[PDB]
Amino acid sequence: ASLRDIKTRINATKKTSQITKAMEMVSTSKLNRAEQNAKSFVPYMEKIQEVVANVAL
C-alpha cells in the first residue's frame, strides 16, 4: 500500500484509540462512584432479611 494510505489508517486508529481510552476513564470513574452505593446499601437489606427470616415463616 502507499504511504498516503498508511498515514490515513494510522491517524484514524490513533483517533479511535483516544476515544476508547477516554471512555475507559469515564467507565472507571462511574465504577468507583457505583461501588460506594453498592457497599452502602447492605444495612437496609440485612435488616429486612433478618426480620423477615424471623417472622414470615
Binding site: 500500500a1 502507499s2 504511504l3 498516503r4 494510505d5
Partner: protein, 125 residues
C-alpha cells in the same frame, strides 16, 4: 468574442513524452529524470486560458487539464506542479467510486478559488 472550453486529456502523458525527448537529447535530469523546464512548459500552456476584458471583445477560454496519479500519491512532481498552477482542483477517489458514490468528487479536499462568482444567486443561497 466567442467562449471556448478546452480539455487536455493527459498532461502526465505529455510530460512523459517531453521527458523522453529531453533524455534522448541528453539534457541534465532533475527529480524523477524530468527536465528543469517541465513546470515552465505546463505553466506556459495553462496561462493562455483567460477571460478577456470588454475592450478586447469579452471572449473567454476555460481549461480542464487532467492528471493521472498512481496509488493516490498527490505529492509527486507533476501533480504538485499542476496543482500549484490551477485555480482549483477536483479529486476523484476509487474508495467513493466503489462504495456507490459516483461521481466520486471528494468535496472535502476539492477546492475552487473562483467559487461564488461562478454561481448564480439561487445556487449560492
Amino acid at each position: 468574442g466567442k467562449h471556448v472550453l478546452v480539455v487536455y486529456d493527459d498532461l502526465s502523458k505529455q510530460a512523459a513524452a517531453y521527458r523522453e525527448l529531453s533524455l534522448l537529447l541528453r539534457r541534465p535530469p532533475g527529480r524523477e529524470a524530468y527536465p528543469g523546464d517541465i513546470f515552465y512548459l505546463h505553466s506556459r500552456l495553462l496561462e493562455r486560458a483567460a477571460k478577456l476584458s470588454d475592450a478586447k471583445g469579452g471572449g473567454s477560454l476555460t481549461a480542464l487539464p487532467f492528471v493521472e496519479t498512481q496509488a493516490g500519491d498527490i505529492s509527486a512532481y507533476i501533480p504538485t506542479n499542476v496543482i500549484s498552477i490551477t485555480d482549483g482542483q477536483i479529486f476523484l477517489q476509487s474508495d467513493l467510486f466503489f462504495s456507490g458514490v459516483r461521481p466520486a468528487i471528494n468535496a472535502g479536499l476539492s477546492v475552487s478559488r473562483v467559487g461564488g462568482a461562478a454561481q448564480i444567486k439561487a445556487m449560492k443561497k
